[PDB]
Amino acid sequence: QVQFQQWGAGLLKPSETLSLTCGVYGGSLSGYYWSWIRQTPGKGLEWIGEINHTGTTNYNPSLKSRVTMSVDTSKNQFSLKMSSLTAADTALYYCAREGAPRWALKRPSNWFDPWGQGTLVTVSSASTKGPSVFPLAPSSKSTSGGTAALGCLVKDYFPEPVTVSWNSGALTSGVHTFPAVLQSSGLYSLSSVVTVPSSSLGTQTYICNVNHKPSNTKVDKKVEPK
């Protein structure tokens, strides 16, 4: 029943001030400690800090110089502020509650039980850039026994994420959308592929739909054989 809604800007420059807030539904803040936990994509979990309904806070010692937390009991919300940001602060940020009640000072903490969803926060000096969508055409060298592979390369965009569909979602089987890679440039590049019957080439249309909200970009790229 207890769940979270999170908001706060997710794209910042270094040395800006990150501010995130979670509203709590289905349960009150009073009696519990509430924490922020972050996770770099591909990495593990790092606890940031916790606050109770009276404002008692506890922070990770490796972050206490640039992290504060607030609570708004009238709105049943709590907030995190993080300063002197760097690219290393790019991560998914979660709200969580302790699994059991605990008053303002109890030396050993509890476990986390209800976790909220992870919101991506990106810290970079790069400015928002829409992706270039390049076709990956089926050929002689992308066929194998009646099966032809085609796709699209979503290159030089920032920041994450991008959503990729095939034929506006009517095409799903055999689709592989790959995690993006961060280039030296600070821009992202991803690919989406699909294997189809090679007899379908010439009559069946294959279009890749790429949506990048931060740049307000949506591209419908038709992929045609050789």
Binding site: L45, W47, W111, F112, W115, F134, L136, G151, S189
Partner: protein
Amino acid sequence: EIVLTQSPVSLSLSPGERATLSCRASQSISSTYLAWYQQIPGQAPRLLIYGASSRAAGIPDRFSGGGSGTDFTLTISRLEPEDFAVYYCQQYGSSPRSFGQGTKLEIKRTVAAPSVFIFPPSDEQLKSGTASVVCLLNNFYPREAKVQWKVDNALQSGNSQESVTEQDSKDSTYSLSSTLTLSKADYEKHKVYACEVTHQGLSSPVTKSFNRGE
């Protein structure tokens, strides 16, 4: 800081088998201050066990926890398809609360050779002054595979990036995409572009190549 070292890093098993994951703390901690969380890629962590052995509501009895002092264990008696995810350990006896680096529980299936495809750069990218060549490895197992880019038989280094998808939900295979990026001058300076794939399922490396002006 209490460091938590999880073991092993990766674990390939099949549904119906027994899994046991270890959590070692750099210092001795009481069992009441240990927890285990499960995480499927793309979703938030989910509480499995707290206080070393207590199961959170909804968690079946096939999940067991124990240990004391410096060493703790999570045991999945008979593995179900739902159970294949990442597993993290956590201590909350000492500030700050620390997590282990995780253990990945992957479905163990039959060796499958990849289907290797190659894609030259499009004309749209060529007018941008850049050329990217793509090589696709489709539906293979296990995850370990080697991709090598060769331009006129010159092995490439520092000019390519690859990405691997999560383990597929129905055939438990992996797929990999590799991108080789050159300037369009460097790209037009050469003729033969090749992707060489090494994998457990192939009796010899498989090369997919093309020529500029095909």
